Each structure stands twice: as C-alpha cells, then as structure tokens.
Design a protein around this ligand. Structure first.
Ligand SMILES: [Ca+2]
Lengths: 206, 557
C-alpha cells in the first residue's frame, strides 16, 4: 500500500517510519514529533517567529520585536514557492502529519493535551510549510551562522586611534583582533592545503 | 562542538569510527530528537535538533555524517548613506533607491499591541541607524535567499552513498558549518561548508564598508575554495570549532579568535597518543576532554619559569608545585560538590589578575571589559555552554610567547616590566585571595565544582517546559549536548555498521493532563551522567527485534 504509514517505536521510544513515498514518509515523521514534543515545538515556533508575547505577555515584547527585525518573511515564502513538487512534499508532508495529531489532540484534550498547555493557558494551532522552514532558520541559521560585531569593532578601533594615534591604533587593533594567525591549530594539515585568499587588514575602505 | 573521525589507518577492529558532540547547551526536553526513516529512497537512523526534516547526526548503512559550527566570516555590515530630505531612500550606484519596508504588530497577552516597522535595502535588513551621520547599517549575509536550500541539502545528503554524491549536497549547504563524512570502506572526509562573499580588493572584513556601491561584493566564492580534505595523511579529522585550515580567516566577532592557544589541541594529543584506537577508546575521549582544564597546558611553563628561583617556603612557589603535580583532569569529591584538586581555582584567580595587569590595562574603557574574563565564569546552575579559552587568555598567550608568536606586539602588554615580575605579582594576588578563604594548608582546600543544568527555558530564554521540569546534574561535563558514535565494518560483529547515541533526558517530553509523565520522559538521564549510550537501529530485523509498540495509519493525500 501507498496509503499506509507504519510507525514502530523501539525500547527507548525512538520512532521508525515506514512509507512508500515522500509525502507519507514525512507525514509520519511530523506525526510522531507532535506526539513526543508538541509543547516544545509550539514554543520553538513562537520563538523563531516572534509571537511569544501573545501567550506570555509584556516581558517578551522586546524579544518579539528583535526576532522580527532579523528576517524577511516574504523572502522565505518565495523560496518555498519555487520548490519542485518532490521537495515541497517534504515540507508539507511534515506539516500535515503534525496537523493530523494536533486535530486528535484538540478533539480529545482531556487525555491528549500536554499538561504544559493548560499551565500556560493556550492551545496548539495548525502548521504550514512556512513554520517548518522557520524552525530551521531560527535555530540553525540565526544561532550559528549570523555572527558579526563589525559595528563594535569600529568603536574599539576608533578608541584605540584616539589613545595611540592613527597608525599605531591600527597596529594595536591587529594585535587584539588579528585577521589570521599562522600558528593556529587547524583541522586540515598544511601538507594537504592552505587557503588561497589574502585579505586587507588596514581597513582600506575608509 | 567537537568531532573526531578515525579512518582505516588509525582504527583498531573497524575501518572507520565517528564520534560527535554537538554543543548547544543543555535543555529539558532534549535539544535533539531521535528518528529513523525508511522509504522513498531513504534508509536512515540518528537524531537531530528540533526534529528538522534532515538529520544532522546519523547514518544510512553506507555512510555517516556529523557537524560542528564553522565560524567563518559570512556576514558583513554595509553603512548606508541616508538623506535628511527624501527619507526611506539610500544612495546606491549614483541614484536614490527606495528601501523595502513592512509593518509589524506585536499582540501582547494582557497588554496593548505594539507596531513598528522593519526596513531593508539591497544589502539586507537595517540593524541600526545614525541620524547624526545619516548612516544606517545593513546586515548582509552570504546565505541570504538560500535558507530553504540549506535545509534541503541537509535532507538530501542522507541519501548519498559516497563522497562524490555527498559533496554535491555539501556544495548547496550555505550556512557556515563544518560537515564530516565516514563510510563502510573506511574513507573519511571533511568540508567547511557555506557561501562566502567574493570581496573587492582592500575590503577589511572585520569592519563596516560604505554601502554606496563601490564596496559591494562581486559575488560568492566557488565551492572549490571551501576548505576540504578527503582521507588525510594523518588518519584522522578533529575539530573543536578551531580553524579549518592555514590562512583561513575567522568570524569578525571581537570575542572570537583562532590563535596558538586552542582547545582542539586537547583532542589531538589524545588521538596522537596511540597508534590505533578501538571504538571504546574513541568513546572514552569524551570522558577525558569533558573533565580537562583548558588553561593548564597553556600557562604552566610560564608559571614554572617564573617561580624557579623561589624558596621552598614561598607560597607563590607552592601554588605552582601543586599545579605541576596535577594532570588537569577535574574529578568530584565524595560530597558531590567540590573538586579533588584546587588547580582550576588557582588558574582562575591568577588569570583574572594577569589580564587585569596586561590586556585590560592597554585597552581604553569601556572596551577593557571585553578582555577581562578568565573563561571560568559561571553561576550556580553552571555554564550555559562549552568551556573555552577566553579571548583575553588567547591574546595573553601570544604575549608570553615572545618573538615566537607571529603576531606583532605593537604595544608591550607587560609595560616595560620583565614578564616574570608580572607573573609573580599575580601569583601573590592569587595566594592572598585563596588563603584568606580557605586557609594556608593547600592540601585541604575543597574548591567548588561546576554543576550542569538541563534548563526548562530554551536558548532564546523562552519557556518550553514548566520550571519544575529543570534537571540537575552534579558534574559539569565539557561535552556534546548529545554524543553519537558510528562504527563501520566492526571485526567484532556480522553487522556492517554499529551506532549508538544518548538523548537526555529522553525521547519524549509528554506529560498528560493528569500529570502522568511519559514512559520515555527521563529514561536516558542517568545514562548521560555515567557516559553510557544506547544502540541506534537501522535494519528492519533489528527494529522488529527491539519493537516496543506499533501504530499503522492509512492516509491519502
Ligand atoms: Ca565580516
């Protein structure tokens, strides 16, 4: 069967999904995620999209504004609109599977609604592909691939320039925040290769 | 996050061994989610953060993969030229271009809603503006527009069956991440993935560039420039967020440096100590590196040199002799709260004093505070992430290396004094502070250990569990949030692959409305503490043999 999804859990409760096409596969995956981690997933959805203050109040308004400042939702939606039907199936299968368990939960809350929801006073909402993509953007791209302190760097550089004068201020800046240091231990040995590019380290753009 | 991959020429009783310890902090429920997928071209087992569609850690019976944060510089800030008259516009390539803008309304539970506007230029979203200079800063990411493709690369790569197919998916992953590879034949590889800008000549990537047009990136560098190695001469690949390769520039973060003092050396020493390693010994590197003080190695020779001509009864020297007898491994006492040796406390106090006399003194306020931490800074709940060597300590290490450091010491951080005098003064400060609180008999110093908290709030500071769901672990371990090991072609089994992981507190975070906790809510928590691990299954036979339950769905799209 093409309509069948078999879910086997092991002795530690880890789910294995057996399906015959993409949409069914990731529907299974989303359905067990909704079973195991609904409250965590709903709070991560609010965190990555900046909708925490709606269920938690005034202490989270700055947080919500900072999250929304740091991305552009239409750009994410356009990337989702250009996927091919096979790639789109991953995302929408996953959201549909989540939705199937959320429908049973909001229909039988006396036994199925995670305690947390009653504690914090709100219930789960249905997911779309955009929400699945925003979990990854928010917790992976934004936490580990968005780092910069270029504005602060400049304020340090300016202060060193006032203290030690223009040329030496720069040389102290390179002592504190060097561009590269040839003695750093590397994952690739020099015998195998080295980076070919060389960069400016005098702030030549001013 | 760290990773060691051991190939054919270094492995004992197997062809390949991969051990990964991604460091995300510690949370309840667990930061990663265990999942096996069988069908539509997929046949995988592993665990992954926030149950992403693609598994960041796992294998598919032929190859295995793993990741560590890369920290390359893929974000630069463009200083945009505004106009007092004609607001909402910015100069770009000789014309006044209009900004993209969107309005947002923040609904607030038991409060009034708040609305604000978000602005964007060709370079990215505006971070901040300087109306005095009529300058607005735009953050420009090299991966902008490739978020969804990166997610999909991480999914599709689970189907690869060898290096060539795997690197094609690594070329599409645009975030600065290190990716690692191992296979059933004993091949091992590494790629520092992501999209990096092709900058104009004279662009210093540590500081802002004018956004008026002439400094615009030219494009993105090709994938052939990404640092990468396949079957390295050494027999192994190790990374603890250190530099990928010689001459590769690091993030522009003022607190982040790749220098001569780096915690990856702690993994290297252990892998170079033995000609070959078994799975059990590769796994045991987790326990050693978890407990290892990172500063001992760095500054013990300086401390020894400076106290060499001191008498037996000078307390500064007895502090160094205690350190000299120590291997730097922290162990708990029987009380569950103090360390067996005082070493980390001494280094902490010494290092804070040394920084305050050297690096801190050369930098103007209020930037001096960026270089004062010793790197031991924690609280009662313990460190929120990994222990590292602080920035101040990496800069101080270059300084005590003399003309053996490649970094020109434009200011003398010792300010005209012989090093040994500054070292001895800091050692006097250390003795004064510690003897006051513990007394003069060093042998009965019982200094406080760091503990470990599985927090109920997630990394953004937002609740994802009630506060009582917090869990405490008496021993702090500088290790992955999860640890997973994959062993290919074991000589000790008939199976081609064996894999193990540990996902604490457990795979479920479900609590019923009557407060009844799921059966798998916390059955991995003691296993994590003890450095234990559970088997990951992949084949149907193994899944059936270990089944605890089954659920069948019939659905049509
Ligand atoms: Ca930069």
């Amino acid at each position: 069967s093409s309509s069948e999804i078999k879910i086997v859990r092991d002795e530690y409760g880890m789910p294995h999904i057996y399906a015959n096409d993409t949409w069914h596969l990731f529907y299974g995956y989303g359905y067990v995620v909704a079973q195991d981690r609904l409250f965590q997933m709903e709070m991560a959805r609010r965190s990555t999209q900046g909708t925490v203050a709606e269920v938690l109040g005034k202490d989270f308004v700055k947080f919500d504004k900072d999250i929304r400042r740091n991305y552009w939702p239409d750009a994410i939606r356009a990337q989702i609109a250009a996927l091919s039907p096979e790639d789109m199936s991953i995302l929408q299968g996953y959201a549909d599977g989540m939705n199937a368990w959320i429908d049973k939960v909001n229909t039988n809350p006396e036994t199925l609604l995670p305690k947390q929801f009653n504690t914090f006073g709100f219930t789960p909402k249905r997911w779309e592909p955009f929400d699945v993509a925003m979990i990854f953007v928010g917790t992976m791209a934004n936490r580990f691939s968005d780092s910069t302190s270029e504005i602060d760097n400049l304020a340090l550089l300016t202060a060193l320039k006032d203290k030690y004068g223009v040329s030496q201020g720069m040389a102290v800046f390179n002592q504190l925040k060097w561009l590269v240091n040839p003695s750093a231990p590397t994952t690739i040995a020099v015998q195998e290769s080295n980076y070919p590019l060389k960069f400016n380290q005098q702030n030549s753009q001013t | 996050s760290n990773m060691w991959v051991i190939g054919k020429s270094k492995a004992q009783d197997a062809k390949a061994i991969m051990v990964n310890g991604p460091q995300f902090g510690w949370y309840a429920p667990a930061y990663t989610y265990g999942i096996g997928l069988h069908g539509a071209g997929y046949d995988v087992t592993g665990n992954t953060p926030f149950a992403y569609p693609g598994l960041v850690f796992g294998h598919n019976g032929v190859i295995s993969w793993g990741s560590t944060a890369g920290f390359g510089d893929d974000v630069d800030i463009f200083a945009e030229r505004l106009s007092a008259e004609k607001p909402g516009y910015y100069l770009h390539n000789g014309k006044w271009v209009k900004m993209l803008s969107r309005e947002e309304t923040i609904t607030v539970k038991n409060g009034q809603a708040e609305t604000f506007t978000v602005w964007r230029t060709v370079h990215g979203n505006i971070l901040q503006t300087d109306q005095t200079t009529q300058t607005a800063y735009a953050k420009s990411r090299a991966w902008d527009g490739k978020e969804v493709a990166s997610l999909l690369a991480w999914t599709h790569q689970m189907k690869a069956k060898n290096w060539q197919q795997w690197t094609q998916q690594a070329a599409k992953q645009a975030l600065t991440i290190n990716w690692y590879y191992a296979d059933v034949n004993g091949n091992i590889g590494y790629v520092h993935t992501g999209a990096y800008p092709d900058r104009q000549s004279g662009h210093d990537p540590r500081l802002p560039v004018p956004g008026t047009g002439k400094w615009d990136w030219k494009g993105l560098l090709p994938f052939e420039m990404n640092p990468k190695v396949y079957n390295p001469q050494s027999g192994y690949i190790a990374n603890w967020n250190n530099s990928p390769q010689k001459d590769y520039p690091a993030s522009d973060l003022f607190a982040f440096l790749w220098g001569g003092a780096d915690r990856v050396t702690e993994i290297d020493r252990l892998l170079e100590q033995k000609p070959r390693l078994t799975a059990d010994q590769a796994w045991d590197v987790i326990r050693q590196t978890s407990r290892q003080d990172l500063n001992l190695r760095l500054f013990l020779p300086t401390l020894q040199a400076a106290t060499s001509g001191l008498t037996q009864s000078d307390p500064r020297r007895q502090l160094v002799e205690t350190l000299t007898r120590w291997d730097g491994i922290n162990l708990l006492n029987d009380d569950g709260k103090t360390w067996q040796q005082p070493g980390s406390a001494i280094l902490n106090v010494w290092l804070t004093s040394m920084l305050k006399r050297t690096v801190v003194a050369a930098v103007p306020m209020p930037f001096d505070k960026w270089y004062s931490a010793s790197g031991y800074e924690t609280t009662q709940d313990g460190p929120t992430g990994s222990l590292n060597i602080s920035v101040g300590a990496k800069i101080l290490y270059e300084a005590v290396q003399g003309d053996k450091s490649p970094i020109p010491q434009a200011v003398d951080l010792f300010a005209g004094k012989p090093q040994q005098e500054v070292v001895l003064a800091a050692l006097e400060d250390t003795w004064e502070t510690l003897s006051k609180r513990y007394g003069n008999n060093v042998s009965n110093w019982k200094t406080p250990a760091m503990a470990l908290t599985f927090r109920a709030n997630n990394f953004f500071g937002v609740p994802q569990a009630a506060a009582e769901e917090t869990r405490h672990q008496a021993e702090y371990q500088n290790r992955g949030t999860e640890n997973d090991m994959i062993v290919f072609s074991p000589t000790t089994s008939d199976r081609p692959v064996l894999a193990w992981d540990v996902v604490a507190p457990g795979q479920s975070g479900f609590i019923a409305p009557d407060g009844t906790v799921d059966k798998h809510y916390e059955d991995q928590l003691k296993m994590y503490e003890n450095f234990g691990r559970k088997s990951l299954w992949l084949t149907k036979q193994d899944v059936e043999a270990h089944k605890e339950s089954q659920e069948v769905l019939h659905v049509q799209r």
